[PDB]
């Protein structure tokens with residue numbers, strides 16, 4: 001790191017999302033509420049796109065919720081995964097794929113930038 | 115079934131989502147955590163698109179959470195709805211519209227497919 | 229009000245979302261489950277677009293969950309924010325930015341509109 005999103009990989013050619021792994025081992029319990037998991041991946045995103053961070057279905061089904069996150073086109077910070085253990089104690093091992101980044105078109109509008 | 119996504123219907127012409135129903139009667143309690151509800155609808159999706167499964171607002175407000183799900187362009191499995199009773203006991207009757215499929219453009223990138 | 233979405237503002241030029249504030253002071257507890265917060269902003273959306281309502285990351289991290297909401301292209305009602313206190317008591321002050329509206333392309337399909 002810092003590593004750009006061009007280093008992320010897709011599971012398969014037809015996968016919508018780019019996979020995201022935590023760089024740490026983390027244990028989460030329901031009483032902890034939302035935690036921001038480090039990925040060591042950084043924006044910004046390709047021109048005219050923004051990002052959505054979503055959970056992987058297999059991880060959601062194992063009781064780890066990823067709250068959808070919006071990554072702005074010009075965000076240059078670290079992409080973090082906002083996560084919560086739903087019901088039980090969840091253990092995230094270093095390098096496990098926990099979420100996915102989806103890229104979507106950024107529509108321009110005349111909304112004021114105030 | 116198997117039924118393709120072309121069999122899904124929109125509530126109205128201007129509806130973003132295609133409605134999804136469970137093919138079973140299911141009761142959900144908060145302690146159960148995430149459950150994958152059968153729809154009997156199968157991918158794949160139209161060329162150059164991927165799917166997002168989201169909750170219907172009326173169903174969310176009645177205490178059933180649908181976790182956002184990504185449906186890859188070339189997924190040929192059954193589209194399932196990942197769902198949780200938030201606070202109370204929720205009963206899903208066979209044929210009730212529980213979620214919606216939204217289609218979005220699949221942006222191509224040079225990310226490796228490893 | 230009624231106020232149209234053209235009155236919403238972006239945090240910065242590169243922000244994907246248009247910010248949404250509640251027009252009321254609201255306290256939320258976990259046992260309350262989902263609440264629909266008033267914004268005094270109304271659809272409809274620009275041609276060929278639909279909307280997604282998502283949480284702001286800073287608000288999610290402070291324990292207020294926004295359930296993703298789909299806003300249809302031709303929705304002319306009030307845009308409400310579906311929200312839940314995750315673990316703790318959350319207080320929403322009048323005018324605090326609580327969610328964001330993202331605009332996305334509405335793909336046309338031949339799905340029946342029944």
Ligand SMILES: O=c1ccn([C@H]2C[C@H](O)[C@@H](COP(=O)(O)NP(=O)(O)OP(=O)(O)O)O2)c(=O)[nH]1
Pocket residue numbers: 053067068069070071072073075078079080081082239243245283284285286287328
């Ligand atoms: O899961 C997420 C969500 C957002 N982020 C980063 C990227 C995004 O561009 C940035 C700001 O996100 P939001 O607009 O959702 N957050 P907020 O409204 O609290 O911050 P700001 O006022 O800077 O826009 O936070 C993540 O790293 N992970």
Ligand SMILES: O=c1ccn([C@H]2C[C@H](O)[C@@H](COP(=O)(O)NP(=O)(O)OP(=O)(O)O)O2)c(=O)[nH]1
Pocket residue numbers: 011015017055056057058059100167181182183184185186187189192193194195196
């Ligand atoms: O709500 C959902 C989410 C995903 N799915 C299916 C369709 C999608 O293409 C497939 C894989 O989804 P994810 O990439 O989110 N899951 P995961 O990363 O666990 O599986 P894989 O390693 O196969 O990519 O699972 C559903 O049926 N419902």
Ligand SMILES: O=c1ccn([C@H]2C[C@H](O)[C@@H](COP(=O)(O)NP(=O)(O)OP(=O)(O)O)O2)c(=O)[nH]1
Pocket residue numbers: 125129131169170171172173214281295296297298299300301303306307308309310
């Ligand atoms: O967060 C949200 C979600 C939806 N809505 C409004 C806008 C949208 O067009 C409308 C209908 O949303 P859904 O299709 O998700 N709800 P549902 O399927 O329950 O209603 P309908 O049968 O009218 O389509 O509700 C909001 O105001 N906030």
Ligand SMILES: [Mg+2]
Pocket residue numbers: 011015017056100
């Ligand atoms: Mg995957």
Ligand SMILES: [Mg+2]
Pocket residue numbers: 125129131170214
């Ligand atoms: Mg609907």
Ligand SMILES: [Mg+2]
Pocket residue numbers: 239243245284328
């Ligand atoms: Mg913001």
